Amino acid sequence: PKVVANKYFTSNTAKDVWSLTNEAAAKAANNQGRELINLGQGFFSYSPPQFAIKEAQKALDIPMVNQYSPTRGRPSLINSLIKLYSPIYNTELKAENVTVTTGANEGILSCLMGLLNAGDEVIVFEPFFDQYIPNIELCGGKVVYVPINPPKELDQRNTRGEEWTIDFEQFEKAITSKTKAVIINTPHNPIGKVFTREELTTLGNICVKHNVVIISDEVYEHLYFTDSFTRIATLSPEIGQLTLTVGSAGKSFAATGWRIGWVLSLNAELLSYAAKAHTRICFASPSPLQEACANSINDALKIGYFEKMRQEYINKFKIFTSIFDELGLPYTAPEGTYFVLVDFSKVKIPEDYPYPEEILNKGKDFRISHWLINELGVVAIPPTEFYIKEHEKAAENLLRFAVCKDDAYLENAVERLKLLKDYL
Amino acid sequence: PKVVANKYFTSNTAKDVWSLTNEAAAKAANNNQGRELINLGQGFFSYSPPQFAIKEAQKALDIPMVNQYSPTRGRPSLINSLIKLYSPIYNTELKAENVTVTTGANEGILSCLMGLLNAGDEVIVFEPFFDQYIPNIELCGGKVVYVPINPPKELDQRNTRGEEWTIDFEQFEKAITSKTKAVIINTPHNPIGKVFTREELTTLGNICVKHNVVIISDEVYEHLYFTDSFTRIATLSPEIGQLTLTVGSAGKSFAATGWRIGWVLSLNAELLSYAAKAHTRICFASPSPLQEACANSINDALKIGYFEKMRQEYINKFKIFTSIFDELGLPYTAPEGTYFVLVDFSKVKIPEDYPYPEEILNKGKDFRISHWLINELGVVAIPPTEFYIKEHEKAAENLLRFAVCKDDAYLENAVERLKLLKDYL
C-alpha cells in the first residue's frame, strides 16, 4: 500500500557516515591477507569491569528487580547517584534532583521533549553529536549551529583542547526570543576538548542572562586527562538552576549496551519536565541493570576504578598518538574521551584516486577515509558529518580515531599506519 | 527561573488513576490497622521470570561484546529466534527485514507512531484504551479519535464473555477520514481480557485496507489466552498483512516487565523500516544482554512448553479468583486472555452518603467504588474509566479492574478478604 510516513524520515534518504563507512570497509577487504583495523567504532571492544558484570548477574537473582522500576528510577540507583554527585555539587541532593533514563541519548531526548514547543530553537556546537539533530527536530525544534572553531595553527603543529574555541560573541548573537536551550558537550566528542571553567563560566552567565536552559552532555565526565573536569552546573547558583546535566552508565562502565543514563539538576521543576517526558517515551528504564549500576558506582568508588580507567586511557593515547608524532601529522591531543582528531591534509593521495559517486559531493575527509580504508585497511571517521555543509571546511582534512580498544590492537594499528610513509 | 516547558505537560496537570489510588491506600493503611492491604491493582508480575530466562540472562552477561551497543534493529540472535518463532505462525519464511527489536512494546508502539505520523494525522484508539497510547500519539503530533468497544447489555445481570464486548464497526468506519493514519488494536485486550475473533479482526482489517489505514496491533498478551486459538490480524489476508505492524513484549511474555525488550513485525518491510528508523532516533539500540537473554529464552520456551504452562497457570489463577464473584453474585466478564478481569460492582450497597475526597467527586462512579473498597475492605482495584474519554465513560462506570498476576496463595488470600462484600450484599 501507499502509506504516507512521517515526512521527517521520507525526506531524509541519504546514507549517513556509518552506513557509507561500513560499505567501503565491506568491500576494501579485497587488503587480502590483511585484517581490517577499525578505529571508527565509538564503543569499547572489550568487556565491562568484572565487578560490573557480577553485580548485574546478582541483580537478576532478585525477583522484583526483574519487574518495572519506578518511572524516575530505582531508589537504589538514585541513591548511589545522590551519594556520588552530592560532594561534586555542593548540595545535599535529593531524589527530586535526579532522574534515570534509558541511556544518555534518550535522556537528552527526554530533556528536549519536556521543554520544546513547535518553533522553539535549540543551539548546538559543531562538530556535534549526531543524535542531537533528530532529537531536537523530532520534538518540533529548530536547530541553530554555532561552531567550535579550530586553531588557525590546526595543521602545522599538534594542537590542544583549549585551542578550539567558541565565539561567545557569535554565540550570544544566535540567541533569540525563540531560543529554548543550548546543548553543550564536555568532554567533547570528537574534539576530546574539555571546556575550561572560564569557557564554561562565560556560557553559563550568558544563558542565565538570556534565560536559556543548559543541557550539558557529560557522558565522558570520568574520561578526562586534565587536572580537573569542570561541571558547568556547579559554577554559579543561577547557572545551576538552568542546567540539566546528563551522564552515561555505558560510557562510564564500558557497557554501552546497558542503556542506563541519568539527568541531574539543582532545579527540580526543570528536571520534572525531562522526567515526565521519559515516562511517556520509555516509561521505565531496564531494572536489572539499574540495580547493577547502583552497586557498581559504589564498587567503583571503593576501588578507584575511574582513576584507573583514566590512566589506562592516557596510556592508550601514548601508544596511539606516537605514530602521528613520528609521521609528522598534526592532531589535537585529547583532553578527554577516547577520540582523537588527526589532520591528514599532508597525506599525498593520487589527485585521480577512484571514489564512489556517493562521496564526491562530500567534504574531503570522506574521500581521505575512503582511501585509507581501501589502501591501508584502516577505518577512521570523517568528522564533517557532524557539521553543517557551510561551516564544514574547517575540518575537511581531519579524521576521527577512537582508541577504546585494548593496547595490543592499538599497537598493531600503529604498525599498519606506518604505511602512511609511502605517501609522505 | 521562568522557562516555558512543553505545553503538552504544563497543560495536562490533573492526577492520574495511579496517584489517586496510591494516595487513597496511604490514608487507608491507618483506619485496616491489623490488616495488610491486598493490592490487585498492579499490572505487573509479583514474581520472578522463569528460572530458565534468569539463567540465560546471567550467562549472556559473560560474553564481552554482548555488553556493548547492539545493531540498531536488534541483535541477530534475537531476530533469528523471532524469525523462528513466528515464521510458522505467519506462513512465510520471515527475514530480518520483517523483524525489529525495540526497548519494550511501549516504546516500540511509539516508534511505529513516530515513523508514520505527520502533524494533523489522526489515530483511532478503542476504549477502554491502554494509557500510554494517548501521549505516544499526541507527542508525535497526532490527534486521537476514540471509538468504544461496547460492553454487552447484560453486563450487570450475569457473567458475560469477551466476545460480548463489541466494536460498532459502522461507527468505526464512519470515524475514518483522510487524516486517519492508523488504528491501534489491542488483542488480547487490556483490560476487558477480550480476544478479538477471526471474524471481528477480518472485518476490522478489511475496513483498514479499504481506507488504506495502518493497523498497529498491540499483542503483548499473545501468549496469554484461554480461547481455542489466538488470531493475529496480520495473518488474515495478504492485503491486511501489508498494512499491519504487530507488537510483542518480552516482559509480558516472560514475566519480566523490567527487561524492556519488545519487537515489531510486519510482512511489509518498507512499512516496518519507518518504525525502525524512529527507534534508532529515540533509543538508538535496545539493552544488549537482555536481547541475548531473550534470544535464548525464546528457544528454551518452545522446547519445554513454557507458553502452554503459563496459560494453564493463569486459567487456574482465575478459577481461584473469580470463584468468589460467582459466590457473591457479582457479574464479571470472564477473561479470554491477559491477567486482567473486569467485575461489575453495581450491586454493592455502598452508603449513599459515604465520604469521598473532593478530588474524585467529578470522576466516573468506579473511582468512588474503588475508594470505598480500599477503605472498607483494604482491597486495591483500578477504576477503568481512567481509560475512557469522559463522553464515553458511562458504559464502564460500575466496573473495577483486577490483575491476578500474583501467586496463588496471595490470590486465595484476596478471595478470603473479598468474602466481606457479603455484608454489603
Say which CATH number the domain at A200 has.
Answer: 3.40.640.10
DSSP reduced 3-state for A286: coil
Same domain, A79 and A174: yes
HSE-CB for A207 with a 13 A CA cutoff: 31
Same domain, A40 and A66: no
Cell output for B352: 449513599
- Residues A66 and A75: their CA atoms lie apart, in Å, by 15
Chain A residues within 8 A of B4 when measuring between CB atoms: 117, 180
- Residues A335 and A188: their CA atoms lie apart, in Å, by 9
Task: Work out the minimum CA distance from B311 to partner chain A, whole angstroms.
Answer: 20
The chain A residue lying nearest B71, using CA atoms, is: A257
Which of A173, A152, A164, A171 has its CA nearest to residue A195?
A: A164
Q: What are phi and psi of A239, to 5 degrees?
A: -65, -45
Same domain, A73 and A125: yes
Residue tagged 459466590 (cell numbers): B327
B32-66 burial code (b ≥16 CB/10 A, e <16): eeeeeebbbbebbbeebbbebbbebbbebbeeebb
The answer to whether B116 touches A3, Cβ cutoff 8 Å, is yes
Q: What is the dihedral of CA A294, A296, A302, A306, to 10 degrees?
A: -120
User: B interface mutation test: which of A2, A9, A241 has the most B CBs within 10 A?
Assistant: A9
Task: Work out the minimum CA distance from B343 to partner chain A, whole angstroms.
Answer: 26
Pick from A45, A259, A273: which is nearest to B5 by CB?
Answer: A273
Same domain, A369 and A230: no
**Total domains, chain A:** 2
Which of A132, A5, A4, A137 has its CA nearest to residue B115?
A: A5
The chain B residue lying nearest A260, using CA atoms, is: B287
Pick from B61, B214, B256: which is nearest to A3 by CB?
Answer: B214
Domain boundary among B258, B286, B305: B305
Secondary structure letter of residue B265 according to DSSP: E
The answer to whether B425 touches B349, Cβ cutoff 8 Å, is yes
Cell output for A41: 567504532
How crowded is residue A363: how many other Cβ atoms within 10 Å of its Cβ? 21
Q: Where are the beta strands (DSSP E) in A25-134?
A: 37-38, 98-101, 121-126
Chain A residues within 8 A of B111 when measuring between CB atoms: none
The answer to whether B282 touches A106, Cβ cutoff 8 Å, is yes
Chain B residues within 8 A of A249 when measuring between CB atoms: none
How crowded is residue A391: how many other Cβ atoms within 10 Å of its Cβ? 15
Cell output for A38: 577499525
The answer to whether A148 touches A126, Cβ cutoff 8 Å, is yes
Which of A414, A415, A374 has its CA nearest to residue A25?
A: A374
Q: What is the dihedral of CA B202, B207, B211, B216, to 10 degrees?
A: -50
Same domain, B281 and B317: no
The chain B residue lying nearest A57, using CA atoms, is: B58
Chain A residues within 8 A of B44 when measuring between CB atoms: 67-68
The answer to whether B360 touches B386, Cβ cutoff 8 Å, is no
With vertex at residue A280, the alpha carbon angle to CA B130 and CA B99, rounded to the nearest 5 degrees, is: 75
Residue B41: CB partners within 8 Å, gap ≥ 6?
A: B21, B380, B381, B382, B401, B402, B403
Contact at CB, A46 and B64, closer than 8 angstroms: yes
The chain A residue lying nearest B47, using CA atoms, is: A63
Contact at CB, B132 and A43, closer than 8 angstroms: no
Domain boundary among B284, B305, B326: B305
Same domain, B287 and B347: no
Contact at CB, A60 and B64, closer than 8 angstroms: no
Pick from B65, B67, B181: which is nearest to A258 by CB?
Answer: B67
DSSP reduced 3-state for B11: helix
Pick from B6, B115, B118: which is nearest to A273 by CB?
Answer: B6
HSE-CB for B400 with a 13 A CA cutoff: 27
Angle separating helix axes B288-304 and B306-328, nearest 10 degrees: 80
C-alpha of B2 from chain center: 38
Instruction: Give the N- to C-terminal CA distance of chain B in Å, as an integer.
Output: 56
Residue tagged 551497543 (cell numbers): B69
Q: How many A-B residue pairs are in contact by the CB < 8 A criterion? A: 192
Q: Give the resolution in Å.
A: 2.0
Q: Where are the beta strands (DSSP E) in B107-225?
A: 122-127, 143-150, 160-161, 166-167, 180-186, 214-218
Task: Work out the minimum CA distance from B268 to partner chain A, whole angstroms.
Answer: 9
User: Please, is A19 exposed, middle or buried when counting C-beta atoms within 10 Å of its C-beta (0-12, 13-18, 19+)?
Assistant: exposed
Contact at CB, A285 and B2, closer than 8 angstroms: no
Chain B residues within 8 A of A133 when measuring between CB atoms: none
C-alpha of B3 from chain center: 35
DSSP reduced 3-state for A32: coil
- Residues A160 and A151: their CA atoms lie apart, in Å, by 9
Same domain, B271 and B322: no
Chain B residues within 8 A of A238 when measuring between CB atoms: 1
Same domain, A100 and A24: no
Domain boundary among A304, A323, A342: A304
DSSP reduced 3-state for A201: helix
User: Please, is A83 exposed, middle or buried when counting C-beta atoms within 10 Å of its C-beta (0-12, 13-18, 19+)?
Assistant: middle
- Residues A354 and A370: their CA atoms lie apart, in Å, by 10
The answer to whether A196 touches A225, Cβ cutoff 8 Å, is no
Contact at CB, B54 and A48, closer than 8 angstroms: no
Any bridge partners for residue B259, and if so which?
Answer: none
How crowded is residue B353: how many other Cβ atoms within 10 Å of its Cβ? 5
Same domain, A299 and A312: no
Residue by residue, DSSP assigns A120-152 as -EEEEEESPPTTHHHHHHHTT-EEEEEEEE--G
Cis omega before residue A150 (within 30°)? no
Contact at CB, A113 and B1, closer than 8 angstroms: no
DSSP reduced 3-state for A402: strand
Q: Which amino acid is at B43?
A: G
Q: What is the dihedral of CA B16, B19, B23, B25, to 10 degrees?
A: 90
Which of A423, A412, A419, A418 has its CA nearest to residue A38?
A: A412
The answer to whether B262 touches A20, Cβ cutoff 8 Å, is no
- Residues A265 and A79: their CA atoms lie apart, in Å, by 15
Pick from B62, B116, B135: which is nearest to A3 by CB?
Answer: B116
Chain A residues within 8 A of B58 when measuring between CB atoms: 56-57, 60-61
Q: How far is CA B407 from CA B45, B190, B257, B339, B412, in A?
A: 9, 20, 16, 12, 9
Which of B107, B144, B106, B104 has its CA nearest to residue B127?
A: B144
Same domain, A231 and A276: yes
Chain A residues within 8 A of B70 when measuring between CB atoms: 257
- Residues A148 and A125: their CA atoms lie apart, in Å, by 6
- Residues B286 and A239: their CA atoms lie apart, in Å, by 34
- Residues B257 and B176: their CA atoms lie apart, in Å, by 34
Cell output for A286: 531496564
- Residues B150 and B169: their CA atoms lie apart, in Å, by 11
| Length of chain B measured in residues | 425
Q: Are strands B38-39 and A339-343 parallel, antiparallel or unpaired?
A: unpaired
B12: alpha, beta or left? (left if phi > 0; alpha if psi -120 to 50): beta
C-alpha of A308 from chain center: 21
DSSP reduced 3-state for A106: helix
Domain coverage including residue A139: 50-304
Secondary structure letter of residue B335 according to DSSP: -
Q: What is the dihedral of CA B402, B407, B413, B416, to 10 degrees?
A: 60
In sign, the C-alpha dihedral spanning B228, B234, B235, B236 is positive
The answer to whether B288 touches A286, Cβ cutoff 8 Å, is no
- Residues B271 and B278: their CA atoms lie apart, in Å, by 12
The answer to whether B111 touches B170, Cβ cutoff 8 Å, is no
Same domain, B78 and B162: yes
Residue B153: CB partners within 8 Å, gap ≥ 6?
A: none
Residue by residue, DSSP assigns B291-308 as HHHHHHHHHHHHHHTHHH
Contact at CB, A280 and B135, closer than 8 angstroms: yes
How crowded is residue B187: how many other Cβ atoms within 10 Å of its Cβ? 29
In sign, the C-alpha dihedral spanning B100, B103, B104, B107 is negative
Q: Which amino acid is at A43?
A: F
The answer to whether A384 touches A343, Cβ cutoff 8 Å, is no
Instruction: Give the N- to C-terminal CA distance of chain A in Å, as an integer.
Output: 56
Residue B63: CB partners within 8 Å, gap ≥ 6?
A: B292
HSE-CB for A401 with a 13 A CA cutoff: 26
Task: Work out the minimum CA distance from B15 to partner chain A, whole angstroms.
Answer: 13
- Residues B255 and B50: their CA atoms lie apart, in Å, by 7
Secondary structure letter of residue A336 according to DSSP: B
CATH number at residue A43: 3.90.1150.10
Chain B residues within 8 A of A285 when measuring between CB atoms: 260
- Residues B43 and B135: their CA atoms lie apart, in Å, by 19
Same domain, B22 and B56: no
Task: Work out the minimum CA distance from A399 to partner chain B, whole angstroms.
Answer: 22
- Residues B81 and B120: their CA atoms lie apart, in Å, by 38
Contact at CB, B260 and A284, closer than 8 angstroms: yes
- Residues A18 and A97: their CA atoms lie apart, in Å, by 36
Q: What are phi and psi of A331, to 5 degrees?
A: -160, 160
| Length of chain A measured in residues | 424
- Residues B349 and B343: their CA atoms lie apart, in Å, by 15
Residue tagged 490514608 (cell numbers): B27
Contact at CB, B107 and A282, closer than 8 angstroms: yes
Contact at CB, B3 and A211, closer than 8 angstroms: yes
Chain B residues within 8 A of A134 when measuring between CB atoms: 281
In sign, the C-alpha dihedral spanning A280, A285, A286, A287 is negative
